[PDB]
Amino acid sequence: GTILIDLSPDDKEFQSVEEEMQSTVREHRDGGHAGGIFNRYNILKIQKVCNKKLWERYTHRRKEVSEENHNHANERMLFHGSPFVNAIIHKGFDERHAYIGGMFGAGIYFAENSSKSNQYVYGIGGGTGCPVHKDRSCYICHRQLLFCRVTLGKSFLQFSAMAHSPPGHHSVTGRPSVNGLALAEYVIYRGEQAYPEYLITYQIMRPE
Ligand SMILES: O=c1[nH]c(N2CCN(Cc3ccncc3)CC2)nc2c1CCCC2
Ligand SMILES: [Zn+2]
């Protein structure tokens, strides 16, 4: 039941999604090893992901969280990079996508920095890079990220350098406590607490 609607680069919606993508690029502590060396992207396409069943699954759960948190879903828009992006847009997030080795336990992880989600597009640590060249820094091959609606509810705040949520909480927030430039990362433990709203197709750009 998934359909993808292509947005025009003239559309304000394309533009505000592009801006969020481009403006949350940062340098990473690995010097580019996982996700490649770049300061910005070439945005090739932005598609709206439309699936009635997945949307209703998302809003049903949002209402539950809201009602357990003084009518505040604490909804954010966050990036998700994954080798399983094609399965996610068709079937939704589920316990199979649970990053077991994640630092906040086995859940589904999201990032405020697009360049952070970019590190996981070809797998954990960037895997072996792109299918075609085995290059984690490939400037040629098309990459995809999701920009997702994520319900955080009452988020457990973790300071720092499928399982269950900590009791009394709907999510975990990873607050950076060393790298002053890094933005937050988040984890949910229920697939229904995120909806994959925009599929972004892009290349990383070789710096001048
Ligand atoms: O976008 C992300 N994707 C992911 N992943 C998406 C893909 N997951 C694929 C996977 C899941 C379970 N086993 C092996 C590979 C790995 C974790 N992790 C993070 C982020 C952003 C914040 C940092 C953690
Ligand atoms: Zn390549």
Swiss-Prot record:
Domain PARP catalytic: 8-208
Tissue specificity comment: Highly expressed in placenta, skeletal muscle, liver, brain, kidney, heart, thymus, spinal cord, lung, peripheral blood leukocytes, pancreas, lymph nodes, spleen, prostate, testis, ovary, small intestine, colon, mammary gland, breast and breast carcinoma, and in common-type meningioma. Highly expressed in fetal liver, heart and brain.
PTM comment text: Ubiquitinated at 'Lys-48' and 'Lys-63' by RNF146 when auto-poly-ADP-ribosylated; this leads to degradation. Deubiquitinated by USP25; leading to stabilization.
Subcellular location: Cytoplasm; Golgi apparatus membrane; Nucleus; Chromosome, Telomere
Annotated residues for binding of Zn(2+): 130, 133, 138, 141
Subunit note: Oligomerizes and associates with TNKS. Interacts with the cytoplasmic domain of LNPEP/Otase in SLC2A4/GLUT4-vesicles. Binds to the N-terminus of Grb14 and TRF1 with its ankyrin repeat region. Interacts with HIF1AN. Interacts with RNF146; this interaction leads to ubiquitination and proteasomal degradation. Interacts with NUMA1.
Family, per entry: Belongs to the ARTD/PARP family.
Protein's job: Poly-ADP-ribosyltransferase involved in various processes such as Wnt signaling pathway, telomere length and vesicle trafficking. Acts as an activator of the Wnt signaling pathway by mediating poly-ADP-ribosylation of AXIN1 and AXIN2, 2 key components of the beta-catenin destruction complex: poly-ADP-ribosylated target proteins are recognized by RNF146, which mediates their ubiquitination and subsequent degradation. Also mediates poly-ADP-ribosylation of BLZF1 and CASC3, followed by recruitment of RNF146 and subsequent ubiquitination.
Protein name as annotated: Poly [ADP-ribose] polymerase tankyrase-2
Protein species of origin: Homo sapiens (Human)
Record lineage: Eukaryota, Metazoa, Chordata, Craniata, Vertebrata
